[PDB]
Amino acid sequence: SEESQAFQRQLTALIGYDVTDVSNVHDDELEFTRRGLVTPRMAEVASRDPKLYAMHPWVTSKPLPEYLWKNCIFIVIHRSTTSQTIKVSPDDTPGAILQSFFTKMQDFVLRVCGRDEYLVGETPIKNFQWVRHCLKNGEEIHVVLDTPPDPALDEVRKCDRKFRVKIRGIDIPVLTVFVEANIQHGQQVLCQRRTSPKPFTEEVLWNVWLEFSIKIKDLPKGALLNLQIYCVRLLYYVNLLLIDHRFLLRRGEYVLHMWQISGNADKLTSATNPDKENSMSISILLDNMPNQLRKQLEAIIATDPLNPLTAEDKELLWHFRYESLKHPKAYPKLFSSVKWGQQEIVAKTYQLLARREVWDQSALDVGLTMQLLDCNFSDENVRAIAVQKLESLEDDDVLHYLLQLVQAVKFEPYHDSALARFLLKRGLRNKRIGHFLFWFLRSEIAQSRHYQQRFAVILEAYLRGCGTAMLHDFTQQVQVIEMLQKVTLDIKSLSAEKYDVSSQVISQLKQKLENLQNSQLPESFRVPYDPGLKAGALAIEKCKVMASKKKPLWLEFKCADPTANETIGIIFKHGDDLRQDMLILQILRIMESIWETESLDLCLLPYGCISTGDKIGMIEIVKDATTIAKIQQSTVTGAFKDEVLNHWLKEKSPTEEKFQAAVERFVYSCAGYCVATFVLGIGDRHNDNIMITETGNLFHIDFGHILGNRVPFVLTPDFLFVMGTSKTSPHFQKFQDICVKAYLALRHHTNLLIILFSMMLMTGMQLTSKEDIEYIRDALTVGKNEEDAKKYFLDQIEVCRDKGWTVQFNWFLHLVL
Ligand SMILES: Nc1cc(C(F)(F)F)c(-c2cc(N3CCOCC3)nc(N3CCOCC3)n2)cn1
Numbered sequence: 001s002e003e004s005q006a007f008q009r010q011l012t013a014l015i016g017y018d019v020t021d022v023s024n025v026h027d028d029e030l031e032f033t034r035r036g037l038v039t040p041r042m043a044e045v046a047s048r049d050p051k052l053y054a055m056h057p058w059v060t061s062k063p064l065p066e067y068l069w070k071n072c073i074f075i076v077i078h079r080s081t082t083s084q085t086i087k088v089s090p091d092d093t094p095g096a097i098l099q100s101f102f103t104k105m106q107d108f109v110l111r112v113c114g115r116d117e118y119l120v121g122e123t124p125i126k127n128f129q130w131v132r133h134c135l136k137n138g139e140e141i142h143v144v145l146d147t148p149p150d151p152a153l154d155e156v157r158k159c160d161r162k163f164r165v166k167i168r169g170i171d172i173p174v175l176t177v178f179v180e181a182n183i184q185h186g187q188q189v190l191c192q193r194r195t196s197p198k199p200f201t202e203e204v205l206w207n208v209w210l211e212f213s214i215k216i217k218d219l220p221k222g223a224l225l226n227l228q229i230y231c232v233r234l235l236y237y238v239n240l241l242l243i244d245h246r247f248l249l250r251r252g253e254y255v256l257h258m259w260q261i262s263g264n265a266d267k268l269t270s271a272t273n274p275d276k277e278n279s280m281s282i283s284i285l286l287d288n289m290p291n292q293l294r295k296q297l298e299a300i301i302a303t304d305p306l307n308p309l310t311a312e313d314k315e316l317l318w319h320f321r322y323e324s325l326k327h328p329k330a331y332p333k334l335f336s337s338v339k340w341g342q343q344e345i346v347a348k349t350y351q352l353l354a355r356r357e358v359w360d361q362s363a364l365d366v367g368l369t370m371q372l373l374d375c376n377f378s379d380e381n382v383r384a385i386a387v388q389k390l391e392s393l394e395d396d397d398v399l400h401y402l403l404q405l406v407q408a409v410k411f412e413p414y415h416d417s418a419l420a421r422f423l424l425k426r427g428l429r430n431k432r433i434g435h436f437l438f439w440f441l442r443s444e445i446a447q448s449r450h451y452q453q454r455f456a457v458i459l460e461a462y463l464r465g466c467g468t469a470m471l472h473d474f475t476q477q478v479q480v481i482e483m484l485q486k487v488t489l490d491i492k493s494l495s496a497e498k499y500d501v502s503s504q505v506i507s508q509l510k511q512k513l514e515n516l517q518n519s520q521l522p523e524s525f526r527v528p529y530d531p532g533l534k535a536g537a538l539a540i541e542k543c544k545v546m547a548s549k550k551k552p553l554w555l556e557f558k559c560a561d562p563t564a565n566e567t568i569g570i571i572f573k574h575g576d577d578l579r580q581d582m583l584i585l586q587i588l589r590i591m592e593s594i595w596e597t598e599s600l601d602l603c604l605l606p607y608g609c610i611s612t613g614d615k616i617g618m619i620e621i622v623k624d625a626t627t628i629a630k631i632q633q634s635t636v637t638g639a640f641k642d643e644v645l646n647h648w649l650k651e652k653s654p655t656e657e658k659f660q661a662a663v664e665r666f667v668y669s670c671a672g673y674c675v676a677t678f679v680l681g682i683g684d685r686h687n688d689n690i691m692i693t694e695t696g697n698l699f700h701i702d703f704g705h706i707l708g709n710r711v712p713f714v715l716t717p718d719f720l721f722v723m724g725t726s727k728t729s730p731h732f733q734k735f736q737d738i739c740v741k742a743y744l745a746l747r748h749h750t751n752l753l754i755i756l757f758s759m760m761l762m763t764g765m766q767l768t769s770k771e772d773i774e775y776i777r778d779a780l781t782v783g784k785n786e787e788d789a790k791k792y793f794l795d796q797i798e799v800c801r802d803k804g805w806t807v808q809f810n811w812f813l814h815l816v817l
Pocket residue numbers: 546548550551552571573576581607619620621622623625626627688691701702703704
């Protein structure tokens with residue numbers, strides 16, 4: 001069909017990669033995966049509620065916090081002229097509120113004023129994320145009687161002998177070298193052979209038959225042939241799945257283009273190097289119970305995920321594997337104790353999985369579930385039982401772990417996978433999920449040559465089922481992002497390695513932007529980091545180019561929603577890998593959850609940020625916020641003064657009653673960022689990397705900088721001037737009381753943070769894993785008593801008092817030399 005070709009052209013333009021193209025494939029897995037996802041796609045499309053899918057009700061079914069609980073409450077309503085306030089009970093259906101509205105006087109829906117968010121469905125108003133946002137921020141719930149959107153807008157378009165591999169030779173377009181062949185399964189190497197080293201040249205031939213110890217029957221599905229080149233240090237690498245998607249053993253001649261290194265999930269990839277004119281290639285041929293022991297494992301099951309098992313541990317686990325089966329928290333360690341290079345053993349582990357009665361009936365432990373989805377596990381079925389526990393996550397939580405579940409796809413041996421199919425369903429089922437699925441996938445596709453192939457096939461599958469509404473919506477989003485990012489770069493080319501920003505460049509930018517505002521960027525576009533916001537025409541008289549080191553584009557747009565006057569602010573930066581920033585910010589959001597469960601709000605501000613390409617993305621502008629550094633520089637440039645901080649809160653808050661609030665907001669925002677940054681290990685920043693709002697909310701910025709390059713956290717005397725310490729004030733007591741509660745509340749979800757962290761460093765960081773990840777263990781005091789850990793953190797606080805301006809004074813010296 002002529003139109004099928006133009007649709008595929010629209011698909012490719014949205015994704016960023018051509019899925020139909022078969023230049024960089026030596027098999028058809030991707031094309032087989034493309035078709036595989038056709039069934040699950042259409043399945044969830046057929047299963048989704050048209051009315052609800054079109055209105056995407058963002059709701060939660062978790063307990064309301066003890067603080068937020070502090071019956072019947074007011075909400076304003078609207079019909080152009082009418083705006084009557086109504087007293088509504090917490091447990092009241094949105095439909096019943098319409099019937100309660102008829103009393104004060106049938107298909108008109110209660111929509112949110114300002115953004116495109118809806119209040120529908122059979123759920124209490126208390127269980128809405130927008131309603132809980134209004135209460136917490138202390139605002140007025142303003143609604144408007146809009147008529148529900150036509151679901152028609154979301155319509156869809158129709159042997160036994162040993163294994164041996166022959167290494168023929170290696171070629172490169174442009175002083176000794178050998179080839180290493182490793183049979184891997186879950187990063188663990190089963191067998192290893194190496195060729196005799198020959199001198200480095202353009203064509204190094206061997207024609208060597210490399211026979212391993214492994215039997216063919218013993219090869220586990222998901223086994224990767226890791227071919228590497230040395231000198232001794234690793235230079236090029238490339239992988240080939242010994243068993244394919246049709247369960248077939250790989251036979252035949254394979255000329256594989258290898259990846260070059262720069263010394264990481266990027267090592268596992270089955271994909272081959274796209275660039276053929278430059279990359280090095282390789283040609284190969286394929287033609288084929290007592291109390292002491294119980295006490296013993298009770299310890300092993302009880303230790304952290306980063307605690308390595310000895311051969312003695314693993315033997316113990318496997319031998320009493322049925323007692324190990326009775327403990328959910330033992331599954332990752334038990335499934336590490338498996339001899340995967342052994343058909344006999346594996347089958348037994350499968351017979352073991354059939355008795356999942358205890359695992360199935362266990363309460364969802366996300367930290368445990370994902371621990372089974374990292375790189376330690378190549379087995380499809382083990383990983384399956386993980387994606388199975390995930391199923392009972394309500395849309396609210398999926399959105400908490402989407403980014404990391406999406407990155408987790410890199411650890412999957414095959415393209416088509418249970419996890420992938422899960423992520424496809426949950427995104428087609430919920431528009432918010434779908435939105436972020438899109439941008440997370442499109443993030444990698446446009447800067448990861450290692451995985452863009454697999455990811456494109458996933459995203460393409462999604463777009464074919466999301467509905468023409470979002471299809472068009474995504475398009476006008478991508479249209480604008482590219483437009484702006486282009487402006488960002490041309491303005492970066494004018495910016496030199498100078499400290500100050502040009503005068504002639506500010507009118508240049510304006511001019512450049514005035515070209516776009518004329519005819520190009522659509523009258524409206526839905527902001528990527530916040531799908532609730534619909535932005536429109538630029539406030540060009542407020543768009544500027546910041547005096548930063550990277551000097552990014554500061555951009556402001558007007559609200560396109562007429563029910564809303566405050567501008568939508570977006571920062572466009574190039575030079576910094578915003579995938580790093582993306583992950584940190586997301587773990588921050590997860591931390592707010594951990595605190596909410598324990599009934600705490602620590603006033604964190606995880607600002608919106610999405611990477612849209614190669615070290616280029618966008619960041620949300622927090623209104624009325626400025627840097628701690630700039631505030632020190634306003635009164636004083638180096639000799640910091642404690643008084644300044646509290647003077648700035650007085651200055652920016654008129655009402656004394658509003659000033660007390662500002663300080664209250666700060667004691668929470670400070671403590672929260674003190675705790676978080678310390679655990680994530682990025683606690684030692686410069687004043688310029690911490691900001692505060694006029695309302696008195698402190699928040700950290702720029703997170704790729706720190707981990708991607710002493711004091712526990714940034715607790716300087718000026719912050720202590722606000723609590724009332726030169727000494728322990730009634731607010732500094734409030735401060736530590738909070739820190740402790742928060743620190744402990746985080747400690748209770750240790751295994752979670754620990755595997756998220758290790759995952760982050762694997763999927764989005766170029767770092768020595770063994771050493772780097774083991775900081776988060778120490779930082780949380782793994783094993784130590786509650787009272788013993790309590791002081792440990794209070795001990796960190798004292799360190800900040802001991803080294804008051806010591807640290808910042810040094811950063812000010814460093815960020816100058
Ligand atoms: N990776 C980056 C890059 C920048 C990047 F923008 F600098 F590139 C920022 C950044 C800098 C900045 N600066 C303004 C204050 O002076 C320091 C720079 N302000 C903000 N904000 C986002 C949150 O809301 C407030 C604004 N982000 C953060 N992370």
